[PDB]
Design a protein around this ligand. Structure first.
Ligand SMILES: COc1ccccc1OCCNC(=O)c1cc(=O)[nH]c2cccc(C)c12
Ligand SMILES: COc1ccccc1OCCNC(=O)c1cc(=O)[nH]c2cccc(C)c12
Lengths: 304, 304
């Protein structure tokens, strides 16, 4: 028992982190097979970043200008290319530590672990959610660019995120591993509107199920509701509308606890309307939305 | 910017996890050099656990009865010994993945990362604190015994905890790597009183400094207090008394923010007496005590 914001073991990803330097800019790269992936803004200078002409900046760069160092060893760069907002540096040596991997574009509301790195060295690992507005509320300082987000299914790492920047609001933005930004963001130092965010309803319900499994049951009530009635409350409280696909994803947790999804919706409805009254659920005094139904089952079943 | 419950990168510890089987019990072992460390209760059966005679149970066991498997390879056990509540299985092969390491006994209020494992396979990593009453509020299921707690200083892993059991209250208990339990706990299936717990005051103050650094400043007020006045409030709210050693440890954060420790104590005093009034600090609606002053500086400075 117990419920924690658990990250995947980061070992397989640690073995892929390298340092990429171009001119005076240093950031992190991901070395998979004979390719190092990194944010394309590694080729910029402070003057460039207000509106960089990436095509022109990259034309002035040659293979030998990209300094890639894996720990203490230097990699020889034999090709370079820009794909969307990422640079792909072909190296002459395949990473011997390359795990089985996939590149995936995650959906908003899904979760992943971030391995925060500086100068190609891992510093920490944390679990987070891709917000409905495509930002991530991460923890990143100068030099963290190129740190990646991932999920691990047994021996396969699915890389879903590469960190590109911090918005003026203090939230984070990045791309999939093909360099396509999540959200409307652009790799420029400009004011960028992140859309209206909402709370991930399916995750809050999944986390209420995790609470019941772990013994925190005070919020269970004698009520039920309908998808329509629940969605009127979710609208008022800036929660994502609950669909039958979400109810279906919550099926296993509903079966495990014997609490019908709409009955859990009625508990959530009461917590939204009345608050927690100074009480806590799984050590939290707010409604947590960073655990998916899959995460709750995985944590509550011990998948390795 | 941003502040997360960040765990150390678990790679160096993942390479040390093995599966230990004795009879029908399987749990996790830590393979460092030519020794595998595991909880001594691996030699018990369900009937034994109410009050096991460990010396007698171990006498019936021979080297060949301890099945140690590192991934898919089997280790040959050439010696066994019990030290306090741990078993030390001498194997004929030194772990090639043994990082530079130390065994340390952490103090209550200090933090560490746990690499939760099942059948010798890592499943997840999370950050937690050793509670003032020597329990840990972890997330562990059946088979998690032998999972370890650690801290990493550059290339050196300081192992501080090995998981032994879940108390009937749902909190966790374990030992240092010499097998000495933290707290009054014994490795028996019995009702065991965990002492009165308190909130880690120095950590809550460190986390308020992390909040100021990251932009959450609403709780700062026009007041100050004394160590004596603050300690009367800390007594009433079951917080650890603040000492000058704690103020001294908070020196660097006080210098970074320019907010005197006693002025931050006055903000904490007001939050204890008035609550958060439906507001949040670093995404939390309660006062967080699982970040030490060292953790706050490390996260806010990017140590790798
Ligand atoms: C405005 O910056 C960019 C905009 C578009 C593209 C790239 C931009 O920056 C690239 C460098 N950024 C970081 O390394 C950075 C990332 C982060 O998440 N937090 C920070 C906290 C303090 C200081 C810094 C520099 C960071
Ligand atoms: C009463 O148990 C012991 C007492 C003293 C000594 C050893 C004891 O158990 C050894 C086995 N324990 C676990 O593997 C276990 C650990 C844990 O943290 N959570 C669980 C959640 C559900 C089920 C189980 C079995 C666990």
């Amino acid at each position: 028992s117990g419920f924690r914001k658990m990250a995947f073991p980061s070992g397989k990803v640690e073995g892929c982190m390298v340092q990429v330097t171009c001119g005076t800019t240093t950031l992190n790269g991901l070395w998979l097979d004979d390719v190092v992936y990194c944010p394309r803004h590694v080729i910029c200078t402070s003057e460039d970043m207000l509106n960089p002409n990436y095509e022109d900046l990259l034309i002035r760069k040659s293979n030998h200008n990209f300094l890639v160092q894996a720990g203490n060893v230097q990699l020889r760069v034999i090709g370079h290319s820009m794909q969307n907002c990422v640079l792909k540096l072909k190296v002459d040596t395949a990473n011997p530590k390359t795990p089985k991997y996939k590149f995936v574009r995650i959906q908003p509301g899904q979760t992943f672990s971030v391995l925060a790195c500086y100068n190609g060295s891992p510093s920490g690992v944390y679990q987070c959610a891709m917000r409905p507005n495509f930002t991530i509320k991460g923890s990143f300082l100068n030099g963290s660019c190129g740190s990646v987000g991932f999920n691990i299914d047994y021996d396969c790492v699915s890389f879903c995120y590469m960190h590109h920047m911090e918005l003026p609001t203090g939230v984070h933005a990045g791309t999939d591993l093909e360099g396509n930004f999540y959200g409307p963001f652009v790799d420029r130092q400009t004011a960028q509107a992140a859309g209206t965010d909402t709370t991930i309803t399916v995750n809050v319900l999944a986390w209420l199920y995790a609470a019941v499994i772990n013994g925190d049951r005070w919020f269970l009530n004698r009520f039920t509701t309908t998808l329509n009635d629940f969605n009127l409350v979710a609208m008022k409280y800036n929660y994502e509308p609950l669909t039958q696909d979400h109810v279906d994803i919550l099926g296993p947790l509903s079966a495990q606890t014997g609490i019908a999804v709409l009955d859990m919706c009625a508990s959530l409805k009461e917590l939204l309307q009345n608050g927690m009254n100074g009480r806590t659920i799984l050590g939290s005094a707010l409604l947590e939305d960073e655990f998916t139904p899959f995460d709750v089952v995985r944590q509550c079943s011990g998948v390795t």
